Ligand binder design. Structure first.
Ligand SMILES: OC[C@H]1O[C@@H](O[C@@H]2[C@H](O)[C@@H](O)[C@H](O[C@@H]3[C@H](O)[C@@H](O)[C@H](O)O[C@@H]3CO)O[C@@H]2CO)[C@H](O)[C@@H](O)[C@H]1O
Ligand SMILES: [Ca+2]
Length: 386
């Protein structure tokens, strides 16, 4: 069925990554994954066979209330990062450790200090950040994990760990980078931004990072085609960073919709009125979208090192008609994007929107955990379809 056009100029060592941070909370909710032969299999094995070479995991400092009730979103702490890391390593895939330096979702709107850092002055918060990263990386190495890359922050467009001043953010970037450098010289340090479509944003950020002497290897970007402008633009803003500053570049988070259907009863992020949808909302469309983002980063040349698909397997804990039954699983295991317990930390967003998966229709597995044809995109970019 599926067609993929060969990506031209694609380097043989290109990073083909997935962020599957929700996997632990989902397996705990009784969710199962399959190979294309239709038998139960560890998702990491199926990912490997599909030609994935890299796993990304989000790390929240303390994603739990005082009583240890998970904030949800996969309840992603260091302990789960090690679980995920061990499995990735066991399956021949390198790890990208994605430190949010927050107790919950870090994005362009939300960059809240971890609860433990809330009353620290800047010096002490900075050494806490450095100390946390170093300790976290030591634990992962101790677990035998193959770490390829560390992301110091996540979509830090406007802040980091409670800080909004770019001179302060830069010192924080350097605190984390320092920990990585001390751990292993071979680990790539990524910084991760989003909204590449914004006029002169990435030029400004890269210049600011340079002026503040931030030590990093990779300038990473999000790319969701619904809001983030053109592939031509993406290539262009990343090429400018690569050429001007001598940085590697990559896409740290990308996805597309394979269906318009909501598989679990919790409203999905996309597709929606007003979003740019250049591809059909189908398995083929989804594969086109992934192949094209890979093309756009490859087109950067030497410096374009990879693409990570964000959450290819945040599938339903159960069908949409059993919404209220699903809610119990989301609430107990944190297998939706947020639980009600996160209202303490994030009242404005998680407080009003808490629930299930907002991205089940952007998975590369169906609602029942079988791989979609579009999962083959990681192999077929090298060769094209027959
Ligand atoms: O469910 C339909 C509604 O979804 C709302 O989106 C919610 C939050 O506003 C949104 O921030 C959250 O996104 C999560 C996280 O904050 C973000 O950084 C990451 O990329 O995605 C996470 C979810 O996968 O998602 C929830 C979804 O309930 C919309 O704001 C609203 O318009 C409506 O469609
Ligand atoms: Ca949903």
């Amino acid at each position: 069925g599926l067609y993929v056009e060969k990506v031209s100029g694609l380097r043989k060592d290109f990073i083909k990554g997935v962020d599957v941070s929700s996997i632990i909370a989902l397996e705990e909710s009784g969710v199962a994954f399959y190979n294309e032969s239709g038998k139960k299999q560890d998702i990491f094995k199926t990912l490997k066979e599909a030609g994935v070479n890299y796993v990304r995991v989000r790390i929240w400092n303390d994603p739990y209330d005082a009583n240890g009730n998970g904030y949800g979103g996969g309840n992603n702490d260091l302990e789960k990062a090690i679980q995920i890391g061990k499995r990735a390593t066991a399956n021949g895939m390198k790890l990208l450790a994605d430190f949010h330096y927050s107790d919950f979702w870090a994005d362009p709107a939300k960059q809240k200090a971890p609860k433990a850092w809330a009353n620290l002055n800047f010096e002490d918060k900075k050494t806490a950040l450095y100390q946390y990263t170093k300790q976290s990386l030591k634990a992962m190495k101790a677990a035998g994990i193959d770490i390829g890359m560390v992301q110091v922050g996540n979509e830090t467009n406007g802040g980091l760990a409670g800080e909004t001043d770019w001179a302060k953010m830069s010192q924080l970037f350097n605190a984390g980078s320092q920990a990585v450098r001390e751990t292993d010289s071979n680990i790539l340090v990524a910084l991760h931004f989003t909204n590449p479509e914004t006029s002169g944003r990435y030029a400004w950020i890269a210049e600011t990072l340079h002026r503040h002497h931030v030590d990093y290897d990779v300038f990473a970007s999000s790319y969701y085609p619904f809001w983030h402008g053109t592939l031509k633009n993406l290539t262009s803003v990343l090429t400018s960073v690569a050429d001007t500053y001598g940085k590697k570049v990559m896409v740290a988070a990308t996805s597309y919709t394979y269906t318009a259907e909501d598989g679990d009863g919790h409203g999905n992020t996309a597709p929606k009125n007003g979003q740019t949808l250049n591809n059909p909302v189908t398995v083929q469309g989804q594969a086109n979208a992934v192949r094209d983002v890979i093309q756009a980063v490859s087109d950067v040349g030497e410096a374009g090192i990879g693409v990570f698909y964000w959450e290819p397997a945040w599938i339903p804990v159960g069908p949409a008609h059993r919404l209220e039954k699903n809610k119990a699983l989301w609430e107990t295991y944190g297998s939706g994007w947020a639980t009600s317990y996160a209202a303490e930390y994030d009242p404005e967003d998680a407080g009003k929107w808490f629930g299930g998966s907002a991205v089940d229709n952007q998975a590369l597995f169906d609602f029942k955990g079988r791989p979609l044809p579009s999962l083959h995109v990681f192999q077929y970019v090298d060769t094209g379809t027959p």
